[PDB]
Design a protein around this nucleic acid. Structure first.
Ligand SMILES: [Mg+2]
Ligand SMILES: [Zn+2]
Ligand SMILES: [Zn+2]
Ligand SMILES: [Zn+2]
Ligand SMILES: [Zn+2]
Ligand SMILES: [Zn+2]
Ligand SMILES: [Zn+2]
Lengths: 103, 103
DNA sequence: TGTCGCTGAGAAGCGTTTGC
DNA sequence: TGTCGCTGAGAAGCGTTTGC
């Protein structure tokens, strides 16, 4: 059931993907088929989300929506998508989601 | 992929299952279809194996073969199968398998 | 510009495997 | 009477969800 984690190279990141980053939480488009889930807000939407570059990372915990990364971690998805060494907050051990800050 | 954990009641344990407990490791029958895996020796065989009674337990880590439970933990599968309150060594946190004693 | 609860999740088994 | 290495594993998303 675990969705495979695939590292998208920074040179392979499209400007269409960059412009499809969500800016306002309430303006999201839910899609049970093509959408992706943000680890923080746990909403499966079509807006572009971050991609963890840690080889040992797995699953969906590296995917964060636009609003979530800039409000819970003070970082921009556009910078994380083009960051060669970006690790998700779970990898950094700084995730403050409902689950992570309890466990 | 996780095999569901089902608690077999002690009153529902068959004498045929009891007599099918493995006694010698080298006299095991491998079966990729009907066999079960022992958490300790990691062999999928048809010999009767233990069943953890912990409700929060999951997966295969509660299944131990005859030789493994009596050689690594000094306990008998026949006693564990009829024990109302038996928890597997992983639940007791005393598992000494190759993986558990490292992590 | 905004978030958590809840279910169900939380591997398993072949291969290179058997104590001195 | 006997055991470990190795791959691949290690959730995800709807519902009861949006900061004052
Ligand atoms: Mg799974
Ligand atoms: Zn989010
Ligand atoms: Zn990560
Ligand atoms: Zn988290
Ligand atoms: Zn065994
Ligand atoms: Zn158990
Ligand atoms: Zn173990």
């Amino acid at each position: 059931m675990t969705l495979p984690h695939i590292i998208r190279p920074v040179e392979e990141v499209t400007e269409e993907e960059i412009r499809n980053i969500c800016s306002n939480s309430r303006e999201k488009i839910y899609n049970r088929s093509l959408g992706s889930t943000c680890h923080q807000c746990r909403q499966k939407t079509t807006d572009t989300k971050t991609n963890c570059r840690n080889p040992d990372c797995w699953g969906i915990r590296g995917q964060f929506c636009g609003p979530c990364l800039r409000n819970r971690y003070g970082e921009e998805v556009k910078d994380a998508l083009l960051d060669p060494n970006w690790h998700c907050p779970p990898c950094r051990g700084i995730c403050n989601c409902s689950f992570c800050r309890q466990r």
